[PDB]
């Protein structure tokens, strides 16, 4: 948008575009001389009153910091006579020079005096107590006595000549430095007063400037054509009729007449996001923890909110609730699982039977009485073929819940497109883009649910498999050797016409006939949409293969949680020695070992690659239909 | 916001322009009568002492 | 209404600065009355004194 900001009502429409310059930096550079002094120890005319106050009182600030530093050091340079006096009457009581030095040229200045003087000298040093060091000389003789001076006073040594007694001029020092401290302590409560308006007042005069020089800066990019600015620059089209109806009650209200010119995802991921984190992450314990550690920030979230947080905490308290809702779904997954710190959960009545009268040791197999009613059935869990039924079972979910969750998106394009009242968008992209993914993957999804159906033990049929039934459905058309439904040879030639018929279309609908309604570039719409086809049809076959780590970090999790108890607490079970202090400590520390593991491994560090896989089938599994 | 009160804001907004405008040319217009009498007071003066 | 408002308000303006100026350029002539009417007024008290030479 171009607006036009007359010169009458300037500044009221640039503080209003904010809530919607060198004498600022030379202000802000007062005002951060300010904030360096403790730390060392609006309308037109109301900032230029204010700006006032911020230089009267920089400037006394000023000059009476400067008239105390420089006071300090005339205090230190008292400091340091006194004590090349009261060390050095000692070194007579145990031609001469006595001074001050710094104790980094002591070595130097005795090297020089060494090598000017051919020996001739007997150089001490006393520490004084920047720090600094006395030096006495005993230049015996003469004609090199100005001249050792000028060794000292070049690298900044302060002689003391005393010439009178040690003990007269320590009383005249004295008389200066507690005269010249109680001037330190004068000045300093002066100062301390100083600044008691100034600490409870800079957050004020520093944002002040801060967006003061922020409208200097801002002023400085429009155009100042004709007497009046030209502020062009770019604004969402959903808050057009905001500005519309912001900027022209606000001119409005204030008279001044003369008006301006304005010229010209995560709605579903509230639940999905922590459904697709628990199907990963499938367990009631773990869940449970991670739903308390939520839990816990969530009823203290007004202790929390008014804290300043770290950038992992502020992670982890900004989503507060996404982890209660995955800890929530957490404790359902793994409720419908068989999975409590990696144990089952006898509930529920058993689908499955064992025989009463075998043999130790051998091999046998269950008979399937009925049906588990809630989740999956817990006579799988100390099972040798168990984890291939497991497999299957979460490849399948994996497959059914991704065919889901890519539908369910993809119809979000179709209201997309109905609400931008595009029917040749919704010809060209939507319909031959369902009827692409559901002749195939959702030909798929039944027919998985379809094998769940039918018996196939008491109906005498070979089970069929379902891989290699979409691979002879694009190689072999017609040629079905396990037939799964009546009629499949002769609709899978449908289906696979259904699909391979809108990769022409998809491909060739939308460019032909945008360049049938121009009778505009056509070269970067049909380069558009050979890509939009490539992307889409790669994108149908390569998400739902890559919505199978829903089974793979599920497996893991499940696996690493079972291979830890196993090796943890397994081997804290015994029934020897019951009530010895030796296998009680062994319980003891085998849960703390296993406790820490869970919660430092299939917690934290295993819970956060499940929420991070959550997030990128949300990011291009979901967000790219 | 709507034709009705963009309109009602125009002619408050004229309103002020206009009146603004009008004390300001009357201010600058009293000066003027007050400036011409006491500069033909002045020139006045120092002729009728040469003319005496 | 929208953008037949800003041309009246543009033009406002314009005549806020116009107003001014008339003023403007009156205040300028008023000052140059004031020497030519000061003139005039010296000329009617060199009379007002040759009458009363006259008159001795």
């Not at chain 1, 008239?67 to 001469?96: A, G, P, T």
């Not at chain 1, 209660?324 to 404790?331: C, K, W, Y």
């Not at chain 2, 003027?32 to 020139?43: P, R």
Request: aromatic share 12%.
């Amino acid at each position: 948008v171009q607006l036009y900001i007359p010169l009458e009502v300037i500044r009221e429409v640039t503080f209003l575009l904010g809530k919607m310059l060198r004498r600022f930096d030379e202000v802000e550079r007062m005002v951060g001389f300010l904030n360096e002094v403790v730390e060392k120890h609006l309308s037109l005319e109301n900032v230029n009153d204010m700006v006032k106050e911020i230089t009267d009182c920089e400037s006394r600030a000023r000059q009476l910091d400067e008239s105390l530093d420089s006071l300090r050091s005339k205090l230190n340079d008292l400091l340091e006579q006194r004590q090349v006096i009261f060390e050095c009457s000692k070194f007579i009581e145990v031609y001469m020079i006595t001074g001050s030095i710094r104790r980094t040229k002591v070595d130097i200045l005795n090297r020089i005096l060494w090598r000017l003087l051919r020996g001739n000298l007997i150089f001490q040093n006393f520490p004084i107590e920047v720090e600094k060091d006395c030096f006495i000389i005993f230049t015996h003789g003469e004609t090199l006595l100005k001249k050792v001076k000028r060794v000292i006073d070049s690298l900044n040594g302060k002689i003391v000549s005393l010439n009178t007694r040690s003990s007269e001029l320590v009383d005249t020092l004295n008389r200066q430095i507690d005269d010249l401290q109680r001037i330190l302590d004068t000045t300093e409560q002066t100062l301390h007063t100083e600044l008691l308006v100034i600490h409870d007042q800079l957050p004020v005069w520093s944002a002040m400037t801060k967006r003061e020089k922020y409208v200097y800066t801002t002023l400085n990019k429009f155009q100042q054509e004709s007497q009046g600015l030209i502020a062009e620059g770019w604004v969402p089209s959903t808050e057009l009729i905001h500005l519309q109806d912001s900027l022209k009650d606000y001119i409005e209200t204030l008279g001044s007449e003369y008006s301006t010119v304005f010229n010209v995802a995560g709605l579903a991921t509230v639940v999905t996001f922590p459904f697709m984190f628990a199907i990963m992450f499938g367990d009631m314990g773990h869940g449970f923890i991670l739903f308390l550690m939520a839990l816990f920030l969530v009823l203290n979230e007004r202790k929390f909110g008014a804290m300043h947080r770290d950038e992992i905490f502020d992670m982890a308290f900004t989503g507060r609730y996404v982890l209660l809702l995955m800890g929530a779904f957490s404790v359902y997954t793994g409720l419908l699982y068989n999975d409590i710190f990696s144990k089952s959960m006898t509930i529920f009545k058993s689908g499955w039977q064992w025989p009463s009268t075998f043999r130790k040791g051998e091999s046998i197999e269950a008979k399937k009485t009925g049906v588990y009613p809630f989740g999956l059935d817990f006579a799988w869990h100390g099972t040798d073929n168990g984890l291939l039924f497991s497999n299957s079972y979460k490849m399948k979910l994996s497959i059914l819940m991704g065919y889901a969750h890519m539908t369910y998106s993809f119809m979000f394009s179709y209201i997309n497109y109905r609400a931008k009242n595009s029917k040749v968008d919704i010809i060209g992209n939507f319909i031959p883009g369902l009827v692409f993914m559901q002749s195939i993957f959702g030909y798929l999804s039944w027919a998985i649910v379809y094998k769940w159906s039918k018996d196939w033990i008491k109906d005498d049929k070979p089970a069929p498999g379902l891989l290699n039934m979409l691979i002879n459905m694009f190689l072999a058309p017609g040629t079905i050797d396990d037939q799964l439904y009546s009629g499949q040879a002769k609709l899978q030639v449908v289906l696979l016409l259904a699909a391979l018929v809108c990769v022409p279309w998809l491909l060739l609908y939308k460019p032909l006939t945008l360049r049938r309604l121009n009778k505009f570039n056509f070269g970067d719409v049909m380069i558009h949409q050979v890509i939009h086809t490539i992307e889409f049809c790669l994108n149908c076959i390569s998400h739902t293969a890559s919505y199978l780590r829903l089974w793979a970090l599920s497996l893991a999790h499940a696996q690493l949680s079972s291979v830890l108890w196993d090796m943890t607490i397994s081997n804290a079970f015994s029934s020897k020695n019951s009530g010895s202090p030796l296998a009680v400590m062994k319980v003891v520390f085998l849960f703390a070992m296993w406790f820490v593991l869970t919660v430092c491994i299939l917690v934290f560090m295993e819970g956060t690659s499940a929420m991070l896989h959550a997030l990128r089938l949300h990011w291009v599994e979901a967000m790219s239909k | 916001l709507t034709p009705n009160q963009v309109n009602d804001e125009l002619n408050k907004m004229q309103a002020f322009i206009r009146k603004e405008a009008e004390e300001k040319a009357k201010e600058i217009q009293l000066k003027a009568d007050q400036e011409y009498e006491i500069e033909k007071t002045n020139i006045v003066r120092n002729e009728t002492n040469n003319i005496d | 209404s929208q953008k037949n408002g800003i041309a009246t308000l543009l033009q406002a303006e314009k005549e806020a600065h116009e107003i001014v100026s008339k003023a403007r350029k009156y205040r300028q002539d008023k000052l140059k009355q004031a020497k030519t009417d000061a003139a005039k007024e010296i000329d009617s008290y060199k009379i007002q004194k040759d009458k009363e030479l006259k008159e001795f």
